[PDB]
Design a protein around this motif. Sequence first.
Motif, mmCIF file in Angstrom:
data_model
loop_
_atom_site.group_PDB
_atom_site.id
_atom_site.type_symbol
_atom_site.label_atom_id
_atom_site.label_comp_id
_atom_site.label_asym_id
_atom_site.label_seq_id
_atom_site.Cartn_x
_atom_site.Cartn_y
_atom_site.Cartn_z
ATOM 1 N N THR A 1 0.832 -1.210 0.000
ATOM 2 C CA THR A 1 0.000 0.000 0.000
ATOM 3 C C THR A 1 0.874 1.270 0.000
ATOM 4 N N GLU A 2 0.255 2.469 -0.166
ATOM 5 C CA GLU A 2 0.955 3.756 -0.222
ATOM 6 C C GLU A 2 1.980 3.971 0.908
ATOM 7 N N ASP A 3 1.633 3.608 2.147
ATOM 8 C CA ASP A 3 2.560 3.779 3.274
ATOM 9 C C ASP A 3 3.580 2.642 3.449
ATOM 10 N N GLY A 4 3.477 1.581 2.636
ATOM 11 C CA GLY A 4 4.385 0.438 2.643
ATOM 12 C C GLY A 4 4.304 -0.428 3.885
ATOM 13 N N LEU A 5 3.211 -0.301 4.667
ATOM 14 C CA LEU A 5 3.035 -1.045 5.923
ATOM 15 C C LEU A 5 1.946 -2.136 5.884
ATOM 16 N N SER A 6 1.433 -2.437 4.687
ATOM 17 C CA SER A 6 0.449 -3.479 4.445
ATOM 18 C C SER A 6 0.470 -3.845 2.959
ATOM 19 N N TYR A 7 -0.137 -4.975 2.614
ATOM 20 C CA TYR A 7 -0.095 -5.538 1.276
ATOM 21 C C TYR A 7 -1.465 -6.003 0.828
ATOM 22 N N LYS A 8 -1.830 -5.716 -0.433
ATOM 23 C CA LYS A 8 -3.137 -6.148 -0.937
ATOM 24 C C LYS A 8 -3.000 -7.029 -2.152
ATOM 25 N N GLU A 9 -3.900 -8.005 -2.313
ATOM 26 C CA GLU A 9 -3.871 -8.856 -3.510
ATOM 27 C C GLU A 9 -5.286 -9.270 -3.881
ATOM 28 N N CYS B 1 6.231 -3.036 9.808
ATOM 29 C CA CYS B 1 5.032 -3.156 10.622
ATOM 30 C C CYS B 1 4.537 -1.810 11.062
ATOM 31 N N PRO B 2 3.207 -1.622 11.167
ATOM 32 C CA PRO B 2 2.703 -0.382 11.778
ATOM 33 C C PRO B 2 3.082 -0.373 13.274
ATOM 34 N N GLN B 3 3.497 0.781 13.788
ATOM 35 C CA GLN B 3 3.946 0.888 15.181
ATOM 36 C C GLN B 3 2.779 1.040 16.159
ATOM 37 N N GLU B 4 1.810 1.883 15.816
ATOM 38 C CA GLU B 4 0.613 2.034 16.650
ATOM 39 C C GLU B 4 -0.234 0.765 16.430
ATOM 40 N N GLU C 1 -6.309 -7.702 2.278
ATOM 41 C CA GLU C 1 -5.241 -6.847 2.807
ATOM 42 C C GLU C 1 -4.610 -7.562 4.015
ATOM 43 N N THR C 2 -3.278 -7.570 4.116
ATOM 44 C CA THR C 2 -2.587 -8.193 5.231
ATOM 45 C C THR C 2 -1.483 -7.275 5.796
ATOM 46 N N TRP C 3 -1.190 -7.440 7.095
ATOM 47 C CA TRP C 3 -0.093 -6.735 7.762
ATOM 48 C C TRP C 3 0.414 -7.549 8.956
ATOM 49 N N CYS C 4 1.647 -7.307 9.385
ATOM 50 C CA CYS C 4 2.177 -7.981 10.562
ATOM 51 C C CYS C 4 2.412 -6.973 11.684
ATOM 52 N N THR D 1 3.486 -12.120 18.166
ATOM 53 C CA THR D 1 3.788 -11.801 16.786
ATOM 54 C C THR D 1 2.511 -12.142 16.026
ATOM 55 N N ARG D 2 1.967 -11.191 15.291
ATOM 56 C CA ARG D 2 0.687 -11.385 14.640
ATOM 57 C C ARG D 2 0.728 -11.159 13.144
ATOM 58 N N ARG D 3 -0.217 -11.787 12.440
ATOM 59 C CA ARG D 3 -0.504 -11.488 11.054
ATOM 60 C C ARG D 3 -2.021 -11.409 11.013
ATOM 61 N N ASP D 4 -2.558 -10.219 10.636
ATOM 62 C CA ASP D 4 -3.980 -9.918 10.480
ATOM 63 C C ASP D 4 -4.359 -9.788 9.003
#
Lengths: 269, 268
Positions: B4-12, B147-150, B89-92, B100-103
């Motif tokens: 994505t634009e902020d480089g902190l998640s991925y879409k497919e 990873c997103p920090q917040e 959409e996924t992020w860690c 340690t998570r993957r949503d």
Amino acid sequence: GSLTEDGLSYKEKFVVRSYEVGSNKTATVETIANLLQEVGCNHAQSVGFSTDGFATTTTMRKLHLIWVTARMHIEIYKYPAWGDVVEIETWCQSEGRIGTRRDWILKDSVTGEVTGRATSKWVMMNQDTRRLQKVSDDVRDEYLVFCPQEPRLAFPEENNRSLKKIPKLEDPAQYSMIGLKPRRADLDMNQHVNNVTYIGWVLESIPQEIVDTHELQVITLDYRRECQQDDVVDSLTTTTSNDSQFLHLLRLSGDGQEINRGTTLWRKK
Amino acid sequence: GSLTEDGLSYKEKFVVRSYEVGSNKTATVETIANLLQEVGCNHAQSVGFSTDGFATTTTMRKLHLIWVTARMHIEIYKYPAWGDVVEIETWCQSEGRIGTRRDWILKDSVTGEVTGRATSKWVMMNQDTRRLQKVSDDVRDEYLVFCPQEPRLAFPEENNRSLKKIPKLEDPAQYSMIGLKPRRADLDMNQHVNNVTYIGWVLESIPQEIVDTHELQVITLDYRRECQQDDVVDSLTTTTSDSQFLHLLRLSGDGQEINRGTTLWRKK
Ligand SMILES: CC(C)c1nc([C@@H]2CCCN2)no1
């Protein structure tokens, strides 16, 4: 995917997924067989067919007739790696009154190199009695329009492997995997066992030492009777042979009734 | 897919295949779980974890370590139909040094409607000794910047289903499917039993009368021990109620627990 310019064949590209690959990070033969079935399903949907069986014509539906696979023959030169794009072309040919034949060509999408090929023989059956029959002129006329009418063979060779007769394995088998059962993931949208499951079950009786040091080059499988959701299967194998060849038999664990027979040819890595 | 634009998640985006659907011509939960794994793997590659390993970092490869799912929680509102396009959409995210998570968030590609959401917790295993261990500081440091920090949770409610403790099923079970064994198609690229096999095995013991008249809404699964290529598994289920069930997977021989979980179903 899309029909080609002449509308007599169909092509589709697939990106190999992480869960579709084996120990060497290349697609398994079951992944290849699933992609073959998928491009075949999309080809039939593109020319107007429904899902009550594979490519049931108007006259077939009226007469309670269905197409069933009689044999599948697959030859792989190179298995595509995880993340690679494979392009598959498929077409159907009318074989007169005997039945039909569906062929496929697998290519490396980047280089255009042919990486594999497959063929399948299809016969007509009354959906209720399960009795086979010749294809009528009326039925033939309904599907001929989507087929190339000149011969177009994925396997044009005089006495090629795709048309070899398969004998019945004699007891005792050299190797076996007993008590195989289908789970819900093994069924299609019509609640029938998926033809790719029979491939996985045939390969279960190949010894692990062969799988780890050799690659599957050719598999030919004859389909005699379908396995039902509550059936239990025994997979039997005997070596017949750098190349290793095997004779295969799948039968119901209860009565010993044959469901499939086939052969595989492997080459040392 | 793409970051994505902020480089902190991925879409497919994925087009649902003919063999990926069940009797109502919509994707099965095993198809959903396979698409979750796939967008997860593409995300790991988009940030420099090559196809020379199964999403493993440089330090993991050096130390012979591989990823192990500890828990998986999936909630589906609408299963996508055969031929539909689903966007995932996924992020860690690290939870200090304890989790340690993957949503994931699943959406209808045309309308943008959220059709499902999932979460997972991870541990590591030495690929040779098979000894489990929490994610180390060295391994964590290799992806914290991606990873997103917040906090960004797919399940943000305090006291939500995804974090509920799962009890152990008591003998005798109401329903059972015995003698399940993995075949070669059930293994991952590392020759371990794959993640969708345990899901499929838990669901095998749900009665057909429930599967035919209900839809799976929620599945939570705790992973205690891996099933090996030569193990035989028994799947046990008991109704706890919508229809709710308590699940247990154990080795047929010694009765050793491999998985426990719950499912929640809605009448069609
Ligand atoms: C899609 C169209 C070319 C078609 N194919 C077919 C045959 C049915 C058995 C194997 N394929 N009939 O029509």
